[PDB]
Design a protein around this ligand. Sequence first.
Ligand SMILES: OC[C@H]1O[C@H](O[C@H]2[C@H](O)[C@@H](O)[C@@H](O)O[C@@H]2CO)[C@H](O)[C@@H](O)[C@@H]1O
Length: 509
Amino acid sequence: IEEGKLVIWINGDKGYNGLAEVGKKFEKDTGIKVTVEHPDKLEEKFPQVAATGDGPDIIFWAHDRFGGYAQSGLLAEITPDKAFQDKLYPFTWDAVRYNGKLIAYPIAVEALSLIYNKDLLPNPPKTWEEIPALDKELKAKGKSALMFNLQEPYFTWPLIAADGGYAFKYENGKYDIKDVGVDNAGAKAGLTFLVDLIKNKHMNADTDYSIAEAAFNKGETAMTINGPWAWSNIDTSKVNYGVTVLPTFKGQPSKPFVGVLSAGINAASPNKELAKEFLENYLLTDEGLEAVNKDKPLGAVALKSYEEELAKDPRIAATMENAQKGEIMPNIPQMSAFWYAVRTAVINAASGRQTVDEALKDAQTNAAELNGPLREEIVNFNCRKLVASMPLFANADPNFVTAMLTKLKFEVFQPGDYIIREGTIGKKMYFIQHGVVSVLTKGNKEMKLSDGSYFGEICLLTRGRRTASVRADTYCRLYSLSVDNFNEVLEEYPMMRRAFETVAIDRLD
Ligand SMILES: OC[C@H]1O[C@H](O[C@H]2[C@H](O)[C@@H](O)[C@@H](O)O[C@@H]2CO)[C@H](O)[C@@H](O)[C@@H]1O
């Protein structure tokens, strides 16, 4: 971030080129440059980087992650006046409330639908249960019935929820965080049906977003499950598609988790006023949303004036029908733990790492018990110890140490793994969070290092070989810090760079 410009983050499946057009209009009027970026794992990156001088001015995501960001102090309260508020649907404003405060601008309402190829399947099935029979019929003609993203639990959730699965029980206007529904009869039946699809070769566990998109848009599968954003690429592929009600499971509708694409203002931004002006006066207008919608459809927009037009589209009416059979996602801080829990369970069940019963038992405990803030805190202090213990960093500015912590990468090694091999060239030093290693120098004396220690640091000043091998003696958990990332932070703190250069200037004598 820098004062006088806007950096916006939005997910790579959304209309980021269209948003950049809105930004080009903004720059033309104010001289303020707008850069739109779509980094991978943006929703996880944002809370890591936002405090530490990095991060976008504006973050776009579904509202479910914003309670967490709000809890962490990473979002500015927004202050639209009543007239502006009246422009958007009251339920969209509700979705972005935390402690009664508005913490983001709602943009669009998202739900998943069944997308079907009308040439391959003129009458799409009404039930999940008839998909195996349909796939066998299609397999004989070199096709498949259904492919969709099995790596993201968002896509499998409607099935899980259909017969009674739920995230957190809603009662008397509030979520009971101790009452998780991911291990109940309904959730187990849903995921069992999905795993049986996999086991009987009607779907593949490795299927991700790209695979399913490419299969449906090339005409290889009769159906997919996706949201409005995906419709552009299907239009471009020329497939004759319909958008309809998701299939029923055990006679019960699929229950997609409804998301409200929302735009938050990073509390670290020096551009909060410019961010408000862009969001209120440029993006949230008929012209602004249209530019984004034209690139990748937004869904049912929060802006009433524009939604009046979009609601005439039967694809948007199918989206809202699915949405009404679903549930608005909670925005509570525990949602991150929930998603992490269900993601691992679905991946483990589908692959056969665990049974459905085992995977979901562990998901229940993870979603209910896991304390993100507490675990984050413990992880951050321990990393801070490791980095600040090293002689080089022993008297450095605490913010320098803090920026450096964000660069650390988690690595694991098995007994007998060489972390560093003598004669090779590395670009990383290592800190030992947990484990024992041997430092071996050809023939010689071993030296054993353990929890708290470090090694490989000479790559910070060498551009040269590894002069010793380092072998894991037990299971090791390490953090690595690369010379590039070290330099990058060292450039952000010029007083430290000068100190370290004067050190190196004397190390030549
Ligand atoms: O898979 C869990 C994931 O679900 C939701 O993410 C959606 C997102 O809302 C959509 O806009 C679209 O981009 O696809 C994502 C699924 O890959 C939740 O918003 C997210 O927090 C959660 O991790």
